[PDB]
């Protein structure tokens, strides 16, 4: 009834901060390599970070595999422990600690594992069969998180990371403080360990063109715009294909801007200290499938 759209030339003549309903074509976007759009964002200190690569994680886990699991830290009231020996793996030993709920192991799909000496591959397989996995190491008096460079919790396809700056890391026995040992809410796990969890976000820079003007607008969101969770996309091939196809739909390489579809959205202007713009309250995924 009252749907009206502001031309870009109008927006560029105005002062920030304001909000605008627009319609424009995506002339171009960054990043060209779409995997680089997935960033980690601390809600506490507002820092943006890269997600560690496979190679980075492999280094950490292999380095963990050089250390011998401490027998003193095995089979507590919190968890049952099992050690596997290996062959042709530099004498590696894997410890899996099965976390109990009130002195009883729950069903596998509700059971949290703590692992010493496991590979990323093994951890990811364990995460399919169990509720979740925390990579750990044998500290002086308790099990401790392996490294904040690696995920503090792998649950399903989500690799949860914590902020190195804002976190005050606490040892594994502090998981006793969780209300149950069957739900394993990531934020609750983080709080128990003194971890400030990082948030996954899609960060992109869109160059929008409606034929009256041109404007650079940022995308920054977790799951609204694509209706694809940024927390899952890096570990899910189908969700990656969806992001590829959506970007290919709005800004197909090679062909001319005349043929592109229109992007209906809101943008907010704001003062950095120059005026920047950012998409908000917008999804492409409600009308596209």
């Amino acid at each position: 009834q009252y749907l009206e759209r502001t031309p870009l030339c109008a927006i560029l003549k105005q002062k920030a901060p304001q909000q605008y309903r627009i319609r424009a074509k995506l002339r171009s976007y960054k990043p060209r390599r779409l995997f680089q759009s997935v960033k980690l964002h601390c809600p506490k200190c507002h820092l943006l970070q890269e997600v560690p690569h496979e190679g980075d994680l492999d280094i950490i886990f292999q380095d963990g595999a050089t250390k011998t699991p401490d027998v003193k830290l095995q089979n507590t009231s919190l968890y049952d422990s099992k050690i596997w020996t290996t062959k042709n793996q530099k004498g590696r030993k894997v410890a899996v600690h099965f976390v109990k709920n009130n002195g009883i192991l729950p069903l596998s799909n509700e059971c949290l594992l703590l692992i010493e000496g496991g590979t990323l591959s093994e951890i990811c397989k364990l995460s399919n069969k169990f509720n979740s996995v925390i990579p750990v190491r044998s500290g002086h008096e308790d099990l401790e998180l392996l490294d904040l460079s690696a995920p503090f919790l792998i649950q399903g396809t989500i690799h949860h990371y914590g902020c190195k700056q804002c976190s005050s890391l606490r040892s594994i026995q502090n998981l006793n403080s969780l209300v149950d040992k069957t739900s394993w809410i990531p934020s609750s796990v983080a709080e128990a360990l003194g971890i400030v969890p990082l948030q996954y976000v899609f960060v992109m820079t869109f160059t929008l063109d409606d034929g009256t003007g041109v404007l650079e607008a940022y995308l920054m969101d977790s799951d609204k715009f694509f209706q694809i969770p940024a927390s899952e996309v890096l570990m899910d091939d189908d969700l990656q294909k969806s992001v590829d196809m959506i970007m290919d739909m709005f800004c197909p390489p090679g062909i001319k801007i005349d043929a592109y579809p229109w992007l209906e959205c809101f943008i907010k202007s704001y003062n950095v200290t120059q005026i920047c713009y950012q998409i908000f309250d917008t999804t492409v995924a409600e009308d596209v499938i």
Partner: protein, 53 residues
């Protein structure tokens, strides 16, 4: 009981690779593109340029 515990131990063991050569795991196409593009420039926006609340 220990038989439920035993079951979880077997499930854990099934996910481990304790012998032979530790083969490379099958990776998604973004992660494959990521591995290839190592060394090149990484897209980055400073957080102060973004509007966060």
């Amino acid at each position: 009981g220990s038989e439920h515990q035993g079951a979880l131990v077997c499930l854990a063991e099934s996910c481990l690779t304790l012998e032979g050569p530790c083969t490379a795991p099958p990776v998604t196409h973004w992660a494959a593109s990521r591995c290839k593009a190592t060394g090149e420039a990484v897209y980055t926006v400073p957080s102060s340029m973004l509007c966060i609340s």
